[PDB]
Amino acid sequence: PTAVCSDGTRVSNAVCCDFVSLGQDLQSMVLQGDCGEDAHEIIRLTFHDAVAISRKLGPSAGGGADGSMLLFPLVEPEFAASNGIDDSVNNLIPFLSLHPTISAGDLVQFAGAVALSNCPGAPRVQFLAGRPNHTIAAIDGLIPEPQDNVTSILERFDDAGGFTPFEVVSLLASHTIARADKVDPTLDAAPFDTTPFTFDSQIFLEVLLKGVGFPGLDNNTGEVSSPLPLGDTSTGGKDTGLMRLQSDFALAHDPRTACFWQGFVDQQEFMSQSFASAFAKLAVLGHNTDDLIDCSEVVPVPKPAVDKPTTFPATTGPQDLELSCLAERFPTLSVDPGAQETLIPHCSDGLENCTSVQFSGPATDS
């Protein structure tokens, strides 16, 4: 039955009210209302937690969205595929004792939902609560890596939870606010698109441009040529150049996924709604939704989509595109004016000096 929360929010179940203070503490203590470094890592973690599950291997291989990353921080976060996930894990662990009525599985997914709401253009995702507070650590090998090919990627997602190629491409819209710290051992926070603090479709457009060089080394596993490789890192700046993942390039050109990939270019609402549907399905892996309760009302209303249309970054244009999709014409778009590449800002405020919250904790990396 209904209750109103202490903030005035009408909920279908007063148990949802516990998440209100959790949301406030996640913002005040870690996310700081920003679509920044900490938010991005927490969103990455929702995926690393959820995807470790296998229909063909059965329940013993992993329980999916179960908080296994937080409850066993000495196991999965140190598997090679999750190198660097320690940051988000360590940031979330303290919230387990601060909010003891909330399971680790609920914590991970609610944190992801709140983090998403900080990103302009992101959908207000569904949030179901009631994941059990106990599980065991998943086995290794369940998380896709950027060097994997499309067949492998699609098989893993289908084996994890019956995801279609469309849902896989939809989930990868998340790379619109994604950067890499471990892919290149010489680079920190190399962004996958020119707007890593904006949930827009630039990622879909920019992976389709011809690659011209690298932001760092030229032979990292899982990385391919980038269309906008230059930054100011060679002179001590923090604006790293753009990085392209092999897996994103492969999804953009494979016959099973290429039309879905291009279909999101300049389609803000279609992209954000598609990501939301596939993400809601990701968030309840390992669970029957019948055993969960709907607490979507306590997910914050997200920052609205930006005014800016989808455009070619400075120095690029349609003549630079490598197209693979015959079913739909690539749209006519404007080109950002400028004779040289525009540095991609290290921080959502346009500067380079922002800092992020990092709690110390048991999870580690290399």
User: Which positions lie near ligand HEM, rule CB under 6 A?
Assistant: 37, 40-41, 43-44, 47, 84, 144-146, 153, 171-172, 174-175, 177-183, 222, 245, 247, 279
Active-site residue flag, 48: yes
Kindly state the smallest distance separating residue 104's Cβ from ligand HEM, in Å. 18
Minimum CB separation from ligand HEM for residue 7, in Å? 27
Residue in the structure block whose two tokens are 């959502």: 348
Whether the Cβ atoms of residue 227 and residue 191 lie closer than 8 Å to each other: no
Residue 11 vs 206, nearer CB to ligand HEM: 206
Q: Which is nearer to ligand HEM, 16 or 216 (CB)?
A: 216
Is the Cβ of residue 142 or residue 187 nearer to Ca ion in the bound state?
142
82's tokens: 């999750």
> Encoding tokens for residue 226?
């980038």
DSSP conformation letters of 195-237: -TTS-SSHHHHHTTBPP-B-SS-S--TTEE-BSS---SGGGT-
Rounded Cα gap, residues 37 and 24, in angstroms: 18
Question: By the 8 A CB rule, do 19 and 295 touch?
Answer: yes
Identify what 198 binds: Ca ion, ligand HEM, none; CB under 5 to 8 Å per kind: Ca ion
Tokens of 159: 């084996």
Shortest Å, Cβ 29 to Ca ion: 23
d(CA 366, CA 362): 14
DSSP helix/strand/coil, 10: strand
CB of 112 vs ligand HEM, minimal distance in Å: 8
Q: Supply 205's token pair.
A: 């457009």
Paired with 321 in beta bridges are 209
Of the two residues 11 and 34, which places its CB atom closer to ligand HEM in the complex? Answer: 34
Closest CA to 284 of 35, 112, 30: 112
- Nearest CB to ligand HEM, comparing residues 47 and 95: 47
Tokens of 17: 């009210």
Query: Of 40, 48, 99, 346, which residue is the catalytic one?
Result: 48
User: What is the smallest separation between the CB atom of 89 and Ca ion, expressed in angstroms?
Assistant: 11
Where on the chain is the footprint of Ca ion (CB under 5 A)?
49, 52, 66, 68, 176, 193, 195, 198, 200, 202
Q: Which pair of tokens denotes residue 148?
A: 């994997």
Provide the annotated active-site residues: 48
